[PDB]
Design a protein around this ligand. Structure first.
Ligand code: HEC
Ligand code: HEC
Ligand code: HEC
Ligand code: HEC
Lengths: 235, 235
């Protein structure tokens, strides 16, 4: 079954221990390098690929929302060759997207992330599919043209992500516009390093506030440009 | 929200890796000492306190069904003094009810238990309360009378659980009727060692196939008798 993407009201947060956990979980997801420096090896927070409005994280259709995610695990992973839990999946995002180290599976910060994801999933039937889950891929027949992609990047992306892909810092030292390549970006093991996933994300979410504005060809070619560049190597 | 206790159809099991996991999970829950001997320190399987029909485990109202349990975690534990995950909760049942050792939080058998619980929870909204969850307690004002309880035990329980509480083995060496005290029963750390929980279980589920037949006084007193006896000590 597919159900709608619903976002709960932060005014109806439970109190007690669970509410305090949810609030800490939102912070870990929004501000991950500063909150979890022992585990993060780049400049990315979860929210840089799992954006949300109103200070929430992971609430946007076609940008891998967390709404409903708790009810989809455990599930099979071809990386692992077996079923994995949601804790383990978060571990892989720390190791790959954040170029870091997985939290222990009972670490309190990991549990607070889980509590926040569960809060966002409230009312979703276990096993159901949320409309707008994941990042829909975009695939062309034909190798991306990074020459075209370089021209598109300069015209549509550079002002935010920079001529050297290094992003723009905000006043408090967190990325306002995150790095797309180089030492502070996602590593080679990340899902965003796959052509069709980057092309899909770009097509649906970029340029910022212009969702679904690039033609399919343009998203494909600019993703290819972006992925020509060096970034940290995953072991 | 409270929703109904629904049990899925084993004929509609998913295939692939998830279906194979679910099936292994049902076996670990039904036949735990034989399947997980490194982790089990008594004669109990999960199904001896979380019974189910038709070979399922954890599907009976007022006998702590697993239907819906996945959507109730993480939650606060006063034992731990913080939020815990469902994997951690299962660990505590291994340590206390099964007098053993917790599985590692990524152990494949634990994940297969989780997969089975998730399958049983299919369609339950995350966060909802399933009708018949847990084991409703029964509490009297007044200390249980174990003299009364001994007479009730002889008349209503002994034929199955034995004069020495040691249970009845089946032909394949698993308990048909499980031990209520002594070295093969639950340890002192288990929830069933608490007077009001044992009284509630008994009242709602015992004698077998005579749910809600003891008066409240009778359940209370027989639970008290049962809990006068030695059993393994929890560290
Ligand atoms: C971009 C560089 C990412 C960063 C930073 C983080 N994640 Fe991610 N995540 C990313 C992709 C491309 C995907 C795949 C989407 C799909 O179609 O399924 C994911 C997925 C997840 C998931 C699974 C979601 C699902 O529906 O199954 C989770 C739980 C997840 N990501 C969590 C997560 C966390 C907690 C992060 C910070 C530690 C994180 N991700 C960063 C891309 C990126
Ligand atoms: C500023 C107004 C932006 C423009 C123009 C573009 N992007 Fe962007 N991007 C921006 C933000 C604020 C974020 C974080 C997520 C959000 O949706 O809030 C992003 C994220 C990305 C990512 C993922 C994260 C990462 O790799 O660091 C990618 C791959 C990305 N953006 C690419 C991209 C491209 C190719 C653009 C031109 C077509 C583009 N972005 C424009 C902000 C802005
Ligand atoms: C009786 C001696 C038990 C054995 C054997 C096992 N469990 Fe148990 N479990 C027992 C009690 C008395 C309770 C509390 C019920 C309540 O009202 O909440 C539990 C609870 C659980 C739970 C949590 C259920 C919930 O709704 O939150 C789980 C997940 C659980 N038990 C699992 C479990 C497993 C997997 C077992 C075998 C390893 C196991 N239990 C054995 C009593 C007994
Ligand atoms: C045989 C027909 C039984 C009679 C009579 C009684 N019990 Fe029982 N009990 C029986 C089974 C098959 C099981 C497993 C769970 C099931 O519902 O399938 C149980 C379980 C218990 C337990 C929990 C497990 C344990 O501690 O080992 C308790 C505490 C228990 N039973 C107590 C109990 C008492 C006090 C009875 C007389 C009032 C009684 N049981 C009768 C089978 C049978």
């Amino acid at each position: 079954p597919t159900v709608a993407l619903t976002v709960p009201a932060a005014a109806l947060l439970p109190d007690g221990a669970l509410g305090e956990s949810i609030v800490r979980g939102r912070r870990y997801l929004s501000d991950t390098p500063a909150q979890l420096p022992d585990f993060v090896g780049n400049g990315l927070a979860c929210r840089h690929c799992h954006p949300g409005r109103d200070g929430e994280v992971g609430t946007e259709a076609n940008a891998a929302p967390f709404v409903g995610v708790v009810g989809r695990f455990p599930q099979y992973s071809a990386r692992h060759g077996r079923l994995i839990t949601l804790e383990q999946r978060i571990g892989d995002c720390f190791e790959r997207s954040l170029n870091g180290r997985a939290l222990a599976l009972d670490h309190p910060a990991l549990i607070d992330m889980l509590a926040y994801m569960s809060w966002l999933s409230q009312g979703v039937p276990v096993g159901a599919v949320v409309a707008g889950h994941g990042i829909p891929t975009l695939t062309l027949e034909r190798e991306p043209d990074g020459v075209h992609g370089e021209a598109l990047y300069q015209a549509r992306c550079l002002a935010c992500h920079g001529a050297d892909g290094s992003g723009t810092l905000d006043a408090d030292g967190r990325y306002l516009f995150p790095p797309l390549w180089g030492p502070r970006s996602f590593n080679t093991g990340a899902g965003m390093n796959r052509q069709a996933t980057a092309a899909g994300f770009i097509k649906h979410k970029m340029p910022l506030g212009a969702d679904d504005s690039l033609s399919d060809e343009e998203a494909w070619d600019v993703a290819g440009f972006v992925l020509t560049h060096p970034r940290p190597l995953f072991q």
